[PDB]
Symmetry: D2
Subunit: 219 residues, 4 copies
């Protein structure tokens, strides 16, 4: 109590609802300030900011389409402008094969996955600037039949592995979390939240590269 | 006594290097060969001739498989020549510096090419209806650039998912991961042997298998 | 607002030195009482006991050779007698070219030491299941991440972890595997592994049973 | 006629083991079959595989009994002069009720049996020195904890041997059956691997369940 500690800062993409919101709650409750990104309207966001604020966090919502690469820098900058630092990124993602259309592959692999890879780059750059050099994390939420989804998921898994190795010397740990089936018995968003809050809280600094199953063992 | 058809293989990029290795091994073991590529009249002639000598009927098809609209003509050409397809062989930096264009090229476009060319061949395999033993053999590899790692993981996930979806047809799906090859190393002949082996029929029941092909250096 | 309860109990096998002590320290600091087992004489453990007490923990040491199956029940009973509960088990335990490998060796490692971990866990699990509020509990197996018998035993332990996790998924008992890299007596510290185990043991990871945690600072 | 490569098929008397011996005989191998039981029902099998071109012998041996190993290898070398292929096929409910005796039998003795039989065969393989393509093929499976442990031990043994034997010409594969499968289906895979075309794929694991590995 002599010395005041910063609330570390977490970006939770798609943190407005579902697993994302389960994650923002757990992080808020465990001492993080929160920046949520999404395309959702103001009325959707308002009670989430109010609730999360209740748990003692300062919370912002950034309305931006992460699929669009030209929105990344502005989004990163709006976070740094609010809090002056970034400690944790949570990349929270959200059929017969003969029917598969290139449109679907383009959307899911060409656009969505690309958006995650490059937002991560934009966030990473701001993290690597700071130099405070505390314990930071990049946590990628994937899951576990649409082959393009399988491919995206696999890509992100290799992304996390590769990133973890590249960042091994830096104090930024990289993790993958694979949620199973979650209701809105079965898993709750609080269960994923708890896992993400555990990984973000610093105790796993030496566990970079790890893959956490999050399906209550059902596999 | 019943005459069996020489089974038909499409070896993509079969003109040089590893593809040629595979194309030879399959020829030598009773396959007719269709090779795809981009190269001029010159780079084609003694290859068709060498493979003809080994006992095969051989056609070359000029195709940039990255271009999706060229798929249907390519398949149609193979079907028009032999009347059936038995085997598809799908053959062939610091993160802060990674560029969206890089991703577009490798994940965005080349992986997409492989997936949808596979889809086109699949449709033609399935229509013929003989229902005999067919194979799709995906050739991959084993600090690298994170977009190649992602496409490689995409491809691997694609093999697994096809295997499962094709499990009740006579089409087996395999993944071959070659190590290091020549221009105590590995030959293109070595890869060929594995592929000839997998395509020869003895592996019908081994669908979903990943074959390491580095003479055990990966361990 | 903030609610403090009685302390859960952790058994840390081999918790007297090295990785085990780093684990016990972190468990103590994170709110657990501790039972340390060791094959060795109870001599020289007093400092550790006094240290972990400085971290708020009641701590006992129990002499036990876990390879000896007949010693299991007594050890488990002694922990229950001291604390009235067990919430966390931390299984923390321990050269040739293959043509020269000997049956005696395979037996020692595979034959006994791995048999030890398996059945000791079985004995703890009975004690855990005999009083369960289906409460938040965990079993954490510490392995590693070249000689063939150790590799096999590693593999066995990984398989054990998976299977036990599946089997225990109905209960509140999560099972994890933690694969340390090389650690100091660069490399990591026993504290890096302790933090991970303390993390797994704290409750936040109940839905994550069956997870394998890399604990080598991502160098593999 | 050319010389015939020689394969040891442990548990080759019936089931999957017979499917492998049948298929290796047809691809040009002579065969030695190993079995815990008496040699009674064997004659038919010996007759069938001769039809396929193969000289075949049956060796009664309990591979769980290490002291029987040397004699078995010696018997195969005595008959045939060489050993080109070892197929490890011989093998055999609530954890709260698991008994140390059960563990000992499956893990501490039977898995031990395979590991050490392989050691003995490999000693014979490495003395021959012929060092053309050779193979050791470990047959496993695609719920009782000790079995899973045994199988995982075997997967890992498989991988280590593969790496240790990398520079030698002896390749090491694991095959994982799940049987609507037939012993022929497994036999073909094994004949493919024992056949040479996979020398550079040592260490590879083969799935053998017709793709019910993520299906049912």
């Amino acid at each position: 109590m002599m010395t005041q500690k910063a609330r570390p800062v977490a970006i939770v993409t798609g943190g407005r609802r579902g697993i994302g919101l389960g994650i923002a709650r757990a992080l808020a409750a465990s001492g993080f300030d929160i920046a949520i990104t999404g395309i959702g309207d103001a009325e959707g966001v308002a009670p989430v900011i109010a609730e999360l604020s209740g748990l003692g966090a300062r919370v912002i919502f950034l309305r931006a389409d992460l699929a669009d690469l030209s929105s990344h820098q502005a989004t990163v900058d709006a976070v740094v402008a609010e809090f002056g630092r970034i400690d944790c990124l949570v990349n929270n993602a959200g059929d017969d094969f003969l029917d598969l259309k290139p449109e679907n592959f383009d959307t899911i692999v060409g656009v969505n996955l690309r958006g995650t890879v490059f937002f991560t780059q934009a966030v990473l750059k701001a993290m690597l600037a700071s130099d405070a050099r505390a314990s930071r994390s990049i946590i990628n939420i994937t899951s576990v039949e649409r082959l393009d989804y399988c491919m995206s998921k696999a890509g992100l898994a290799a992304f996390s592995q590769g990133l973890a190795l590249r960042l091994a010397e830096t104090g930024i740990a990289v993790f993958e979390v694979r949620p199973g089936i979650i209701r809105s018995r079965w898993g709750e968003p609080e269960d994923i939240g708890n896992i993400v809050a555990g990984l973000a809280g610093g105790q796993f600094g030496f566990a970079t590269g790890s893959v956490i199953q999050a399906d209550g063992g059902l596999s």
